[PDB]
Amino acid sequence: SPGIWQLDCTHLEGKVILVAVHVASGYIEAEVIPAETGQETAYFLLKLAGRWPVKTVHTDNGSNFTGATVRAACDWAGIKQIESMNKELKKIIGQVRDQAEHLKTAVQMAVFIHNHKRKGGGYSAGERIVDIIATDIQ
Amino acid sequence: SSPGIWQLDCTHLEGKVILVAVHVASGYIEAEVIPAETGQETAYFLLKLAGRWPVKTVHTDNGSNFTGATVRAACDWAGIKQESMNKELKKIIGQVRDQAEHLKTAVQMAVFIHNHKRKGYSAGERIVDIIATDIQ
C-alpha cells in the first residue's frame, strides 16, 4: 500500500495530461504527453517506477492498455496492473496559466503547488509520501 | 543543508543531450533526454525536479544555458538557490540499449537500475530516509 498508484488522464487545450497519484499520500506526478498511446503511457510509467517504489498501478483500462507496450514496461519494472484530483489540478493550472507561454510549464507549476502546499504542524503531499515510504522501508 | 542540495550535469550520447540531476547526499538520480541544451529546456527540467523533491540548492556547470533569463526565473519562482556519475549511467545505458528502440527509453531503464540496485540500501531508499529524517 506504500506501493500503490493510480494513473488517470485529463485533457486541456486539446492536449493530453497523464496524472499519477500516490494513493496513500495524495502526492502527484503529471506531464503533458504528445498522445494517449501505449508507447507514451509506457514511457511515463517507466519514468515513475525509477523514481518511486511503484508496486501496483490502477489504470482506467482503456485503449492505451490493450496493447503490448504498457504491459512490457510494467513486466520489466515489476509493476502489477479523485476525478476530484483532475479538477483540483486543473483549478491550479488555471491560476498559473497566464504566467507561462506553454501548457506543459503551467502543468509543472501546478504539480509544484499541489505537492508543496501546507493545508494547516500539518504536512504537504511531498512530506506525506516520503514519511509513508521511509516508515515502510525499516 | 545537504538534504536539499542537488547537482545538475549534462552528458551526451548518440548526438542527443541528457540532463542528470544528482541528489548529492544519497546518490539518487533523475535524468532525461532533452531536445537541446538551452535555457528553456533546462528550466523545464528543473521545474519538474523541484515539484517532486524539496530542492533548495542546485549546483550547475554555469555554462551557456545558465547565462540567460529562463533558468534564473524558474529557480526564483521555485525558491531554488544557484563525472563518475555520467560514466556510471552511461555504463548502465549500454547494457540495456539494445532492449529499447529509443535512447530515451534506455535512459529511463538505466535510471531505474541505478536508483534501485542494492549497495544495504539503494539510492532510492537513501533519499527517502535522508529527507524523512530532515522533516523534524
Binding site: 504566467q99 507561462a100 507561454e101 506553454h102 510549464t105 507549476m109 | 528553456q40 528550466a43 523545464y44 529562463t70 526565473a73 524558474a74 519562482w77
Partner: peptide, 6 residues
C-alpha cells in the same frame, strides 16, 4: 515576459 519564454 512569461516564465518560460519572452
Amino acid at each position: 515576459p512569461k516564465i518560460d519564454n519572452x
